Each structure stands twice: as structure tokens, then as C-alpha cells.
Short mmCIF file of C-alpha atoms and ligand atoms in Angstrom, two decimals:
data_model
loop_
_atom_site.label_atom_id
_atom_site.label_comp_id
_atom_site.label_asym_id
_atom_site.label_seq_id
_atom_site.Cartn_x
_atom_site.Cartn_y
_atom_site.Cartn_z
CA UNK J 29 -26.98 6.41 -1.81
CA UNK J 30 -26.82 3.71 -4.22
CA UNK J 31 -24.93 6.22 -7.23
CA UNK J 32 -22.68 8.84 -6.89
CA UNK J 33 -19.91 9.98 -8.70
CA UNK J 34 -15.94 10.73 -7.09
CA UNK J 35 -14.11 13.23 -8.81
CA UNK J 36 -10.21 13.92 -8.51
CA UNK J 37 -7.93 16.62 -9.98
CA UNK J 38 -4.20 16.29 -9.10
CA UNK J 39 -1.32 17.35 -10.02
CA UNK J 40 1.98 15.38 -9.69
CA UNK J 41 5.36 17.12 -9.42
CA UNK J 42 8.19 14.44 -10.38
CA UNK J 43 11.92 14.99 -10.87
CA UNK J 44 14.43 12.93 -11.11
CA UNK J 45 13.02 9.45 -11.07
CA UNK J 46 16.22 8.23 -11.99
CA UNK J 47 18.60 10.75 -10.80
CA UNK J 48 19.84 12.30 -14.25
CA UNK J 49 20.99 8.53 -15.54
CA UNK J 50 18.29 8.23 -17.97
CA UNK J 51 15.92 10.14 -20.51
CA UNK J 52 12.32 10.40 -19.01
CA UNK J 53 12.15 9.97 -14.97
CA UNK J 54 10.09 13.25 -14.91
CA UNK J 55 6.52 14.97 -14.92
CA UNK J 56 5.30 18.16 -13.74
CA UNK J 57 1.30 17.54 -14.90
CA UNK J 58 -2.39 17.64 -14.11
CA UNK J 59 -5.17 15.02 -14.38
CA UNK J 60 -8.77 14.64 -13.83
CA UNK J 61 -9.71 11.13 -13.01
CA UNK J 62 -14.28 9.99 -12.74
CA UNK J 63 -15.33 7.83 -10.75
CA UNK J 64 -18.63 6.88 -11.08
CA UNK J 65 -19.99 3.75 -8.97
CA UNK J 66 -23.16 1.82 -8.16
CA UNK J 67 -24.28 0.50 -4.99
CA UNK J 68 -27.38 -1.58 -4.36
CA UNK J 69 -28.34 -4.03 -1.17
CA UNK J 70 -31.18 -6.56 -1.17
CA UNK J 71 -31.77 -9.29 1.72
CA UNK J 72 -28.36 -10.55 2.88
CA UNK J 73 -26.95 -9.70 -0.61
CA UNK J 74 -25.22 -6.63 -2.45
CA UNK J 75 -23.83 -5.45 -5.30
CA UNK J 76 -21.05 -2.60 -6.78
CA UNK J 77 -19.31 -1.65 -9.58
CA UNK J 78 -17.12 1.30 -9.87
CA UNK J 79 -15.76 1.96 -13.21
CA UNK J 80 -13.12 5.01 -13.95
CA UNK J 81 -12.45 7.92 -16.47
CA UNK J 82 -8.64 9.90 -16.70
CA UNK J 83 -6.97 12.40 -18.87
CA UNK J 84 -4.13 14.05 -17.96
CA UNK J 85 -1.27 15.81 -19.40
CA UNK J 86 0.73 13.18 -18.94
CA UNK J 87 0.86 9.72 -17.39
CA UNK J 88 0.90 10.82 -13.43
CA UNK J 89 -0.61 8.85 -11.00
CA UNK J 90 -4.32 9.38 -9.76
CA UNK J 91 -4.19 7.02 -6.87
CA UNK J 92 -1.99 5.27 -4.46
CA UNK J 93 -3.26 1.55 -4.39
CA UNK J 110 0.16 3.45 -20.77
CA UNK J 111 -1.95 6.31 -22.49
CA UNK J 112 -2.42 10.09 -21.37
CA UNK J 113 -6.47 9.17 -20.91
CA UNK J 114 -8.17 5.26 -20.13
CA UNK J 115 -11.20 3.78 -18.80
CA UNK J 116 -10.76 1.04 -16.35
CA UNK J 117 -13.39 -0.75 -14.15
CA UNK J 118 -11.67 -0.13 -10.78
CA UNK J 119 -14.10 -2.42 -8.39
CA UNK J 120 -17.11 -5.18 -9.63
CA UNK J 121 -18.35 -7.42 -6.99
CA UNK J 122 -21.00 -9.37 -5.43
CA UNK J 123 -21.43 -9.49 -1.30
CA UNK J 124 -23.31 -12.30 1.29
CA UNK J 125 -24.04 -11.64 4.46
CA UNK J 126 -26.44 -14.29 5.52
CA UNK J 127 -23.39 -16.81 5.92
CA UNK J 128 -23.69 -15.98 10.09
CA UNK J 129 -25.75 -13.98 12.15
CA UNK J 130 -22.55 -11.88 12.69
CA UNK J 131 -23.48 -8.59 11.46
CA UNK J 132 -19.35 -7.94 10.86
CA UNK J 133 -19.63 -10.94 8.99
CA UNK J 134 -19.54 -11.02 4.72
CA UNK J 135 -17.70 -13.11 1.86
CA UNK J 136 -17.19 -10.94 -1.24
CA UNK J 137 -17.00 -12.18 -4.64
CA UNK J 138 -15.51 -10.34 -7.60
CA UNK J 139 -12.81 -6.75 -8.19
CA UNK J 140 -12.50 -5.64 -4.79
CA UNK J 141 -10.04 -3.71 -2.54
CA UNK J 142 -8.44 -6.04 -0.29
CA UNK J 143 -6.97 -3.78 2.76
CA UNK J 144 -5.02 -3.99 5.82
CA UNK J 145 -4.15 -1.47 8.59
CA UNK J 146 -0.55 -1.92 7.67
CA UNK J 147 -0.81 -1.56 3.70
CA UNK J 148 2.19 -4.15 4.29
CA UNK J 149 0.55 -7.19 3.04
CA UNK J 150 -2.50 -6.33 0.78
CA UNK J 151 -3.50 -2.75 -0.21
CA UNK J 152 -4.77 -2.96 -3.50
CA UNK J 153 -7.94 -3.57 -5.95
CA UNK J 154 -7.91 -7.21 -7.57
CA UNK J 155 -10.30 -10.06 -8.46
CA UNK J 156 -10.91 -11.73 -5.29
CA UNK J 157 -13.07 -14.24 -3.24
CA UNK J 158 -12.57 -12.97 0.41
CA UNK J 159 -13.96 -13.92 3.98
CA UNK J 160 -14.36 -11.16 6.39
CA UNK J 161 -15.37 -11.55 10.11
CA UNK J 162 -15.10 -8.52 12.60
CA UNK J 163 -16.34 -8.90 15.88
CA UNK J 164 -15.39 -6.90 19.19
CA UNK J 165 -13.57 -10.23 20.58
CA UNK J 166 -11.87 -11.30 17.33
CA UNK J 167 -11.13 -10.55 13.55
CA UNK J 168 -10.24 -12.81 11.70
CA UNK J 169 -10.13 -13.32 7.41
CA UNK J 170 -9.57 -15.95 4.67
CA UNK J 171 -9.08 -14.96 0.97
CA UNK J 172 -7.89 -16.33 -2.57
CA UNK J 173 -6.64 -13.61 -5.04
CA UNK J 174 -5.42 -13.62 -8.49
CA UNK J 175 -4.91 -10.68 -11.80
CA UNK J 176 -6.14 -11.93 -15.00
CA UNK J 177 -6.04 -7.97 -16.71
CA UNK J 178 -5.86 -4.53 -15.12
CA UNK J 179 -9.41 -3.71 -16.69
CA UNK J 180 -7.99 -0.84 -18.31
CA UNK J 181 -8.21 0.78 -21.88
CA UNK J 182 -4.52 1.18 -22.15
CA UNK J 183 -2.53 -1.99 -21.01
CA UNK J 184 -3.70 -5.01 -23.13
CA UNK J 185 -0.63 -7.42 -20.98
CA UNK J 186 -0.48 -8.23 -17.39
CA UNK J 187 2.90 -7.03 -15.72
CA UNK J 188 5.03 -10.35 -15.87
CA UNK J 189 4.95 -10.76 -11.96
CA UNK J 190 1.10 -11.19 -11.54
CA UNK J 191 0.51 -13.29 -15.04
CA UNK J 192 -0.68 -16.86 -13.49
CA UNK J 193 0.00 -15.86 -9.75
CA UNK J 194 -2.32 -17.24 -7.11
CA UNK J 195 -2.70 -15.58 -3.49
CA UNK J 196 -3.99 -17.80 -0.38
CA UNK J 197 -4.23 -15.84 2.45
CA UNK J 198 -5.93 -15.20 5.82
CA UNK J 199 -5.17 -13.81 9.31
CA UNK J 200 -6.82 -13.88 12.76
CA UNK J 201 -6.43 -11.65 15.72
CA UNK J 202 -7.96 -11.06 18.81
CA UNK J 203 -8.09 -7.82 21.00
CA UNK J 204 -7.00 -8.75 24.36
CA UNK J 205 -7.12 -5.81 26.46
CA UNK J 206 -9.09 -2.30 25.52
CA UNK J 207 -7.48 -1.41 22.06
CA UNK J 208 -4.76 -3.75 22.32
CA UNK J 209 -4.78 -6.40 19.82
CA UNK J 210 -2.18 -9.94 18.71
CA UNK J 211 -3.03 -11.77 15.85
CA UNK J 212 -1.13 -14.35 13.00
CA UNK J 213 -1.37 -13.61 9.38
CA UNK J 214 -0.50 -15.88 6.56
CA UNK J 215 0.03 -15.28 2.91
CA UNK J 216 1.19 -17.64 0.18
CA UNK J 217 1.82 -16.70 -3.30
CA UNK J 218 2.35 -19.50 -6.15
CA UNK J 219 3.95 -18.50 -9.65
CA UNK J 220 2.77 -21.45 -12.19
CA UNK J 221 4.07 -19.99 -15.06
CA UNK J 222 6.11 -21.98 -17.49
CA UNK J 223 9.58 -19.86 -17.43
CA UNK J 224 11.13 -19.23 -20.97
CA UNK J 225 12.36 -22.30 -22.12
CA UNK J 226 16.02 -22.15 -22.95
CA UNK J 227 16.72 -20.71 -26.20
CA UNK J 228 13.72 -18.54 -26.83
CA UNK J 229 14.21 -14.31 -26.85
CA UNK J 230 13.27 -13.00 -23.55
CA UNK J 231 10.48 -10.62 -23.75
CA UNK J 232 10.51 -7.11 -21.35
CA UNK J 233 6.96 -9.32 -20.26
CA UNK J 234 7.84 -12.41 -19.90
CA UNK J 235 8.79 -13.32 -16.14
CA UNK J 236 12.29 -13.05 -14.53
CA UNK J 237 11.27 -16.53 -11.94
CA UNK J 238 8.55 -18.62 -10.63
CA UNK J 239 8.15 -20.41 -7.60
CA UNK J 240 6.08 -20.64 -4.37
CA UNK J 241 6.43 -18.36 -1.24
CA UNK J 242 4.80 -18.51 2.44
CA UNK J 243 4.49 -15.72 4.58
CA UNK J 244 3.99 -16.15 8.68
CA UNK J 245 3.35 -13.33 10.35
CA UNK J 246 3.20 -12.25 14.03
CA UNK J 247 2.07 -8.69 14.68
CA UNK J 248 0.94 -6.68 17.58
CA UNK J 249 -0.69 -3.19 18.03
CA UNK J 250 -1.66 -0.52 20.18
CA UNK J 251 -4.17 1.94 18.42
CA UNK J 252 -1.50 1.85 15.89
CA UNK J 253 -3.73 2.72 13.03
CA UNK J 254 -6.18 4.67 15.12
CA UNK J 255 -6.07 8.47 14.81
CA UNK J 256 -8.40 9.20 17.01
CA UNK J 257 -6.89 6.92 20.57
CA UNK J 258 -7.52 7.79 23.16
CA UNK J 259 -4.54 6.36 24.54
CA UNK J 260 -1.29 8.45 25.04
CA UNK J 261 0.57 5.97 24.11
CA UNK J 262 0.53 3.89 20.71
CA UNK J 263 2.74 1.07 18.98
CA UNK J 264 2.89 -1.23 16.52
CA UNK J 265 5.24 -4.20 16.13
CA UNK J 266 5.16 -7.12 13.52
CA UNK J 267 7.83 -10.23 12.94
CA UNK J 268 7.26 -11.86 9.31
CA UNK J 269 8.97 -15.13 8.31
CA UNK J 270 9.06 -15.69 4.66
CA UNK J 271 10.06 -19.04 3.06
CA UNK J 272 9.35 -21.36 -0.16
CA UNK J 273 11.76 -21.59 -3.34
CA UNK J 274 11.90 -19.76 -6.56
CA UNK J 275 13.46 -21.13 -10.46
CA UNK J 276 15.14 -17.70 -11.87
CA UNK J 277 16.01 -16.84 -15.05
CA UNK J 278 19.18 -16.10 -16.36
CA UNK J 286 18.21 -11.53 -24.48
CA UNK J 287 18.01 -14.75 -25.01
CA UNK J 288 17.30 -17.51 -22.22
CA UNK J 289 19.97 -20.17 -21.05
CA UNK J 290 18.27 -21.52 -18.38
CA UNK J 291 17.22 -20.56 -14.35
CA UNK J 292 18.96 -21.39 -11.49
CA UNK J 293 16.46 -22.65 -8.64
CA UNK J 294 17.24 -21.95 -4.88
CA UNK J 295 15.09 -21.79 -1.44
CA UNK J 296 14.48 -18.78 0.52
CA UNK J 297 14.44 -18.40 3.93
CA UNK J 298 13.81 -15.02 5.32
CA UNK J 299 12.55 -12.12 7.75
CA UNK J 300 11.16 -8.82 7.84
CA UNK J 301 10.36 -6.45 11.04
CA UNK J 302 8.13 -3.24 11.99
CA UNK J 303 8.30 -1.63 14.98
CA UNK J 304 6.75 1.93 15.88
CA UNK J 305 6.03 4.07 18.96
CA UNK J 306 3.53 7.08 18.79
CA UNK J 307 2.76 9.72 21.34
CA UNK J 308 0.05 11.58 21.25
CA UNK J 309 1.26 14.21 23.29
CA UNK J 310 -2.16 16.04 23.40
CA UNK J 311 -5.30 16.09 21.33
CA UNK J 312 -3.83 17.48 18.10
CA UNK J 313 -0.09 17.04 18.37
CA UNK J 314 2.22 13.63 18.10
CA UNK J 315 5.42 12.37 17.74
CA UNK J 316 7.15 9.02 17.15
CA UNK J 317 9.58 6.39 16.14
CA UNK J 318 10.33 3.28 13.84
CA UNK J 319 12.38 0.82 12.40
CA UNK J 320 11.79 -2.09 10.05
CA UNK J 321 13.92 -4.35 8.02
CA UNK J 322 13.95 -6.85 5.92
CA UNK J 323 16.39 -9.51 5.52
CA UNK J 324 18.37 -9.92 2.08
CA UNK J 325 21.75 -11.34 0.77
CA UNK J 326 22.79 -15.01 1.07
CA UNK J 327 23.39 -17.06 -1.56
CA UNK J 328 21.60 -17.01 -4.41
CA UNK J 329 19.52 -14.50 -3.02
CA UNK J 330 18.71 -17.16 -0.55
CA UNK J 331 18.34 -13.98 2.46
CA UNK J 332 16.29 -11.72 0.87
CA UNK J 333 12.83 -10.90 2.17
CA UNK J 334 10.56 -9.24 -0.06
CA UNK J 335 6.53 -8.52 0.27
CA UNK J 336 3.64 -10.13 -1.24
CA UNK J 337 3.57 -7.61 -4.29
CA UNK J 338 -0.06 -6.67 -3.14
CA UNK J 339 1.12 -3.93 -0.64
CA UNK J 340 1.35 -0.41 -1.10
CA UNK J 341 2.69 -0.29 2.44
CA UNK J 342 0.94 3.24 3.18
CA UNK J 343 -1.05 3.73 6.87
CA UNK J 344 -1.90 6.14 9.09
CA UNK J 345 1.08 5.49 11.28
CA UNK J 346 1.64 9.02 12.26
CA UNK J 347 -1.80 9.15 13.78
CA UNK J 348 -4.03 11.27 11.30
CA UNK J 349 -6.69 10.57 9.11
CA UNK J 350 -3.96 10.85 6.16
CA UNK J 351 -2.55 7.91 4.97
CA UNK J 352 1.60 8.39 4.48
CA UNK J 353 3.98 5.85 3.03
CA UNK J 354 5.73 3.93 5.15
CA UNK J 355 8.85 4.06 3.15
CA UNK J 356 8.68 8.05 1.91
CA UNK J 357 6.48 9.15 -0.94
CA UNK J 358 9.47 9.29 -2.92
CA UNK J 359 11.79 6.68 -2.06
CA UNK J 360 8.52 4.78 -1.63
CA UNK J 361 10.92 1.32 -0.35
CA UNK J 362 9.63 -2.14 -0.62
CA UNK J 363 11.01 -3.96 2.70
CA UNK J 364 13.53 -5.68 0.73
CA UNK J 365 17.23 -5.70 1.19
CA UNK J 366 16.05 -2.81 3.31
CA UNK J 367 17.04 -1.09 6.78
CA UNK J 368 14.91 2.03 7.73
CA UNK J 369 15.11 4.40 10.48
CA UNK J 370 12.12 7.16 11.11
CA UNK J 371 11.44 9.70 13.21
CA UNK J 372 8.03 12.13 12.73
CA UNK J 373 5.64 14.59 13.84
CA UNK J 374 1.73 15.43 13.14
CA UNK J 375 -0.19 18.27 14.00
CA UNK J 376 -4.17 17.58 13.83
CA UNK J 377 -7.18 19.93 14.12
CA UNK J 378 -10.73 17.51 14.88
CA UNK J 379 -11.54 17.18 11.46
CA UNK J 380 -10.89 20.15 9.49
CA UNK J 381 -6.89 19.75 8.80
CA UNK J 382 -4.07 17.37 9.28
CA UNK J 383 -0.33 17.67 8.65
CA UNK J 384 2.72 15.09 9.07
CA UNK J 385 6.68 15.29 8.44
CA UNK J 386 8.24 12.45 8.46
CA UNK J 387 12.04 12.27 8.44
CA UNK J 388 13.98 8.36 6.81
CA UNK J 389 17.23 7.16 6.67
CA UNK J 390 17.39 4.24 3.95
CA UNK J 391 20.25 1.35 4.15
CA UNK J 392 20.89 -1.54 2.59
CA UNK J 393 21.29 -5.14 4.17
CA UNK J 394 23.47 -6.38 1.96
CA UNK J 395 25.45 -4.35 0.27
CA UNK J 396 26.01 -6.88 -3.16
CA UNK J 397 22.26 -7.30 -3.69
CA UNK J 398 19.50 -5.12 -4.93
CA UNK J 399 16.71 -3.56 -2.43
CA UNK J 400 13.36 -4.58 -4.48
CA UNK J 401 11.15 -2.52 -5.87
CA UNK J 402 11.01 1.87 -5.02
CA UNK J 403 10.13 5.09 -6.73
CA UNK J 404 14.09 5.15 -7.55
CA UNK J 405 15.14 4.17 -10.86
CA UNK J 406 19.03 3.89 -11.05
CA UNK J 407 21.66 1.72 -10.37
CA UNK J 408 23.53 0.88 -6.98
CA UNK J 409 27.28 0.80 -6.06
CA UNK J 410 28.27 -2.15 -5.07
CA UNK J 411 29.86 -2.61 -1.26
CA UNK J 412 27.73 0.90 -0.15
CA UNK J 413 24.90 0.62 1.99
CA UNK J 414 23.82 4.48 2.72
CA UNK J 415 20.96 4.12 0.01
CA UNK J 416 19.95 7.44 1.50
CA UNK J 417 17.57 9.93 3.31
CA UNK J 418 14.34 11.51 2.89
CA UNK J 419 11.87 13.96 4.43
CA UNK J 420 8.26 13.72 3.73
CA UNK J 421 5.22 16.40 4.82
CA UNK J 422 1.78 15.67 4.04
CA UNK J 423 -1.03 18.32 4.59
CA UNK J 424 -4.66 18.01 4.17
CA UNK J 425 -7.52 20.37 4.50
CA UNK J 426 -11.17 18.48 4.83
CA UNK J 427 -14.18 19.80 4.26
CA UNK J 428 -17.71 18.84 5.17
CA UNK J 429 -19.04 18.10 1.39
CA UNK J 430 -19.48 14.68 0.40
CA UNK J 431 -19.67 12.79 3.71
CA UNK J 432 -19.32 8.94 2.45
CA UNK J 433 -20.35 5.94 4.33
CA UNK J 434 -17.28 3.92 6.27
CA UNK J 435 -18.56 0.91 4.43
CA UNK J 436 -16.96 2.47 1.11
CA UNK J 437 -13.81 1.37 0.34
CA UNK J 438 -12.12 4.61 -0.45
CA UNK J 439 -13.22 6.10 2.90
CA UNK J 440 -9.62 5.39 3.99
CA UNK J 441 -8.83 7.91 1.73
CA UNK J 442 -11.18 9.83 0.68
CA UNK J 443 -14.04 10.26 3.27
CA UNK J 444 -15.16 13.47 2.05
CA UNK J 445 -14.48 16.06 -0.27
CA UNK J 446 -10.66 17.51 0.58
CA UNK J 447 -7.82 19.66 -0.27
CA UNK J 448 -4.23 17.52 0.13
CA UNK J 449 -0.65 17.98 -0.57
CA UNK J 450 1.78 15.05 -0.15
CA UNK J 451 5.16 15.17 -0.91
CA UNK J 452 8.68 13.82 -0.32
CA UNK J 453 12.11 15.26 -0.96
CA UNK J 454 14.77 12.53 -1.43
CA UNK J 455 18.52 12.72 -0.92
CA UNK J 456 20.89 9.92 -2.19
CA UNK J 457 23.55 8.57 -0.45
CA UNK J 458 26.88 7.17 -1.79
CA UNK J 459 25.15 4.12 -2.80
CA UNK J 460 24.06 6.23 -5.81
CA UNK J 461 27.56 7.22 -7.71
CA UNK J 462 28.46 10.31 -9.40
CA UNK J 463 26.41 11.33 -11.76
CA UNK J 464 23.57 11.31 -10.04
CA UNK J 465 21.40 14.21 -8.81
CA UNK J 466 22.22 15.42 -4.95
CA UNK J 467 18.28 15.79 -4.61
CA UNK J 468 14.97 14.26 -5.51
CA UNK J 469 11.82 14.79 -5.11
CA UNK J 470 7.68 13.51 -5.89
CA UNK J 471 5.30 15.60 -4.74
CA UNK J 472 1.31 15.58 -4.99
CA UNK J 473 -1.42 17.60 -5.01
CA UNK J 474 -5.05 16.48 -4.58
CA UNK J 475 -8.48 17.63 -4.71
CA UNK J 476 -11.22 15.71 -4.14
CA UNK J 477 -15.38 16.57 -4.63
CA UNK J 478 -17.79 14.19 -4.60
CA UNK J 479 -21.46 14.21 -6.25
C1 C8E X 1 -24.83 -12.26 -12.15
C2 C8E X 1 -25.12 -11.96 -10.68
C3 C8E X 1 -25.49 -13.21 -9.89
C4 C8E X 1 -25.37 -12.96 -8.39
C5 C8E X 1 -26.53 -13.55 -7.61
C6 C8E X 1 -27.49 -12.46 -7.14
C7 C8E X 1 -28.27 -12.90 -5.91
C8 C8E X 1 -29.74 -13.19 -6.22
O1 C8E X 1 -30.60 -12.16 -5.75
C9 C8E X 1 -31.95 -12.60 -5.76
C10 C8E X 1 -32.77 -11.84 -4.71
O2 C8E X 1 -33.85 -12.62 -4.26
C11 C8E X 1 -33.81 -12.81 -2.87
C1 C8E X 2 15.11 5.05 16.55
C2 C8E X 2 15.61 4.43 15.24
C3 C8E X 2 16.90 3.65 15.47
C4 C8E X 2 17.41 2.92 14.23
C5 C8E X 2 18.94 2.90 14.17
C6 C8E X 2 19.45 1.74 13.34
C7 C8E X 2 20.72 2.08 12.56
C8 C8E X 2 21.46 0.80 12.20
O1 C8E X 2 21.98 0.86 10.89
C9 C8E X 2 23.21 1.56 10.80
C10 C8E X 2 24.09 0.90 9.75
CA1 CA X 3 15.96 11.68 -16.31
#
């Protein structure tokens, strides 16, 4: 199939974003979004673009990688394969999704040149990444943290015993803007810092990812040391205050798969924060949508709760969940989090939480998540797509998460939150 064309109606269910602190912070609306693409393949070279039509009732989102309707050109690249006579073997040129099984590092469509090499033995990838516009009819201004930020980035792993696999991953992200010189009126788009930032990564797995293991036992666990320095700003500008950073950021998860269709596990991750200056605080590579199938079904989930939606910042979280599975027709998770906060002076990154914290409390909260998808046999896409992660057929899915502060919110705030999804997905 070299054309086709992926269509999605959803509706998204929103309310409060911020908790009753703020005007806005809520939708309850519907969207189509078109996706038509192009593939084509000649000799050890291919082709694809995949461009992208929305109106909605509002501004909801229509994926999980401004006007009420846009065009955008999603994906645009070129691909070689002759580089090796690996056949798992391709560098990729161009708008592209770069993915990993974590969705911790990179999870996310951008203009890329990227190395991939898959073999039985060993996997291994090397990448350079950078914004330069979102491609879209509505924004005309990159967001302030991608304008002029380079990614370097690879990873290598090798699978040591039957579905076992250790590897190293590396990431390093360089800000070369030029900071608002003091004086000048801060813009809302202008950056808050610069600076340069290495990730090192250790990570190990058991058919974490893998949904279908045949293993009753599954884990994953991952150790991430982050370090470089950053020059922050401190509306009108009087200057930044640079600093190094020196932190660390942990995953660990056990899964059961009790039988063929029913599972249960466990996890805890962190990341570091505090210190002077900020000089503690871990944060991601701003590429990550940190979604996976870690509770073993063919559904994606966030890591962090579809509503809370944490970035591993600042950030302590406990989870506990369940998922029910029937071969390919239907899959269900709930997922249970308890949120808390390193440090209890410093913010937690970015989330799907818009309000203020109290400072000196750390119970940032608790959340339970279900997700619940009906498949159907329509629309069968090829693994080699990029939104087969997703979207491998045509399917019926509700996601949702139901978020309860804790005391780290003050009064004033709502007792309960909640973002919730539904999707439906055909494919021509
Ligand atoms: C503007 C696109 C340039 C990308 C190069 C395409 C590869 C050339 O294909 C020629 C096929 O002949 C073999
Ligand atoms: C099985 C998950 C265990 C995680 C418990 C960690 C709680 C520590 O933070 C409490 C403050
Ligand atoms: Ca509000």
C-alpha cells in the first residue's frame, strides 16, 4: 500500500486543568483529525510523507506524541538501506517519529537524521535531532524550549539471554540560544535558560514492553545520570544566574502475567530534584511522552497517569495495576499512582496540572487510570508504520484518568480531577 488515509474522531473530556485557580483549564469536545500519507520503496531507498487535517470544537488533543482546525505535515522523510547487508539496518533522513520502548527518552515526531540497527544479537542507534517549526497552520513560533536546541543521541543493547536484554543509552541536548540580554522585556516566548545537558543511561528489561511474553514473569529497570550546566533567567530581564547540574532518575517495574489474558504489577521511579540552585533536579530530554505498554497490552498508558501525566522531575511515584486481555479483540488496564515530591521547595517539571504548589508539602497526590480498547479486524497496517504502536488497525478506545490532589495543592482547589479520552479509529 503505498496511500492510504487514517482517520480519527475523539472526544476529550477535561476538567479542571487547573483545579478551579484559573479561567479556562477545561473542554468537553469532539474532533476529527485526516491523515493522509504516501509511501513508496525503490532499490535500497524509500520515501513518506504524511500530512494532517483537524477541526474540532475546541482545541483537544488528537494524539499523544492554537486554532479550532490546522493542517500540519506530521512525518516527511527519506530512508537507505543499502548502508549494510543488515536487513534491520536503515538511516532516515527528514520529519520522523523517533521512538523508544520506554517513551522516557524520545517519543515524538521531529526533523531528524537517525541510525537504526536491529539485529537478534544487538540493537543499537545513533541520531541528531532538532525543531525548526511545528509544520502547522496555526503556530507561526517555536515553543521557547526547542528554538535552537540540538539533540545527539544514541544507545546500544544487546539481548543476553532469550528476551532478556542490557543496554547504555546516551542523550545530550545543547541550548545555543542567546538569553535576553539584560534590560530587554521578556517575551511569554523567549526562553527561561540555556545550557548543555548529558544523559547516561543504564537500563535493563525482561519482555517489559512485550504484550504478548511468553514469560510469566516481566521487569523493567533503568538508572539515568544527568549532568551539564544551565545560565537561567531571572518582565523585564536583569540577568541569569548559571549553575551545574548533577542528577538521577530511576524506573523499576515487575509484571505478572498470571495467565494468558490477566496481569498484575508494580513500580517506582524517581527523579532527583532540589539542591542549590536547582543543582538536584533531574528532568527528561523534553522529547518523551513517557507512555508504554508497561501493563502488558497492546495499549499504550502513561507512565505518570493520563491526567497527572508527570514528567520525572522533582518526582517520586508509586504504582500498582492490573490488565485484563482477550487475543486481539479487547484490552483493558487500571492503573492506580501515588505522586510525591522530592523536594518539597522546588517545582516537579512539566504535568497535565496547572496550579501552584505549597511550599514544605510533598503529597502532590493520587490518581487512578483505566484504559479500554476494543480492536477490530479493518485496516490491518504494516509494523513498519510508525503509528502501528498505536494504531495497528481500526479500533474503539477509551482512556482516562481521575486525579485527586493532595495537600500540596491548597484550598481552593478542586478535591477531584479528571482527563478522559475517547477514540475511534478507521482506516482507508
Ligand atoms: C529530493 C529527494 C532526493 C532524495 C534522493 C532520492 C534517491 C534517488 O533515487 C534514484 C533511484 O535510482 C536508483
Ligand atoms: C511498591 C511501591 C513502593 C513505593 C513506596 C515508596 C514510598 C516512599 O515515599 C514516601 C514519602
Ligand atoms: Ca478553571
Amino acid at each position: 500500500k503505498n496511500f492510504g488515509l487514517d482517520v480519527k474522531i475523539t472526544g476529550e473530556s477535561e476538567n479542571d486543568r487547573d483545579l478551579g485557580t484559573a479561567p479556562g483549564g477545561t473542554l468537553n469536545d469532539i474532533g476529527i483529525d485526516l491523515r493522509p500519507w504516501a509511501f513508496g520503496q525503490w532499490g535500497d531507498w524509500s520515501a513518506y510523507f504524511m500530512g494532517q487535517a483537524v477541526a474540532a470544537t475546541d482545541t483537544i488533543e488528537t494524539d499523544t506524541l492554537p486554532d479550532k482546525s490546522y493542517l500540519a505535515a506530521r512525518e516527511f522523510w527519506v530512508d537507505y538501506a543499502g548502508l549494510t547487508a543488515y536487513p534491520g539496518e536503515h538511516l532516515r533522513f527528514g520529519r520522523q517519529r523517533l521512538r523508544e520502548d520506554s517513551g522516557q527518552w524520545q517519543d515524538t515526531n521531529i526533523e531528524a537524521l537517525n541510525w537504526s540497527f536491529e539485529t537478534t544479537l544487538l540493537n543499537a542507534h545513533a541520531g541528531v535531532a532538532q525543531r525548526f517549526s511545528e509544520y502547522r497552520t496555526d503556530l507561526d513560533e517555536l515553543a521557547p524550549e526547542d528554538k535552537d536546541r540540538t539533540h545527539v543521541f544514541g544507545d546500544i543493547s544487546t539481548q543476553w539471554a532469550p528476551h532478556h536484554r542490557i543496554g547504555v543509552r546516551i542523550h545530550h541536548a545543547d541550548d545555543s540560544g542567546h538569553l535576553r540580554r539584560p534590560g530587554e522585556e521578556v517575551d511569554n516566548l523567549d526562553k527561561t535558560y540555556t545550557g548543555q545537558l548529558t544523559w547516561l543511561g543504564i537500563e535493563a528489561t525482561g519482555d517489559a514492553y512485550n504484550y504478548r511474553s511468553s514469560m510469566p514473569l516481566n521487569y523493567w529497570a533503568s538508572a539515568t545520570w544527568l549532568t551539564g550546566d544551565r545560565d537561567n533567567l531571572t518582565r523585564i530581564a536583569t540577568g541569569k544566574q548559571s549553575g551545574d547540574v548533577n542528577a538521577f532518575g530511576v524506573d523499576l517495574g515487575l509484571r505478572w502475567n498470571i495467565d494468558e489474558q490477566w496481569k498484575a504489577g508494580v513500580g517506582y521511579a524517581r527523579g532527583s530534584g532540589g539542591g542549590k540552585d536547582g543543582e538536584e533536579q533531574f528532568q527528561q530530554t523534553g522529547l518523551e511522552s513517557n507512555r508504554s505498554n508497561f501493563t502488558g497490552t497492546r495499549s499504550r498508558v502513561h507512565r505518570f497517569g493520563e491526567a497527572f501525566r508527570g514528567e520525572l522531575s522533582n518526582l517520586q511515584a508509586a504504582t500498582l495495576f492490573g490488565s485484563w486481555q482477550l487475543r486481539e479483540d479487547y484490552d483493558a488496564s487500571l492503573v492506580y499512582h501515588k505522586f510525591w515530591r522530592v523536594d518539597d521547595d522546588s517545582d516537579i517539571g512539566t504535568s497535565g496540572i496547572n496550579a501552584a504548589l505549597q511550599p514544605g508539602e510533598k503529597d502532590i497526590g493520587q490518581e487512578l487510570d483505566l484504559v479500554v480498547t476494543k480492536y477490530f479486524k479493518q485496516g490491518l497496517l504494516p509494523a513498519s508504520m510508525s503509528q502501528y504502536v498505536d494504531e495497528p488497525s481500526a479500533l474503539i478506545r477509551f482512556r482516562g484518568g481521575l486525579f485527586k490532589p493532595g495537600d500540596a495543592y491548597g484550598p481552593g482547589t478542586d478535591s477531584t480531577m479528571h482527563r478522559a479520552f475517547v477514540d475511534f479509529i478507521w482506516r482507508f
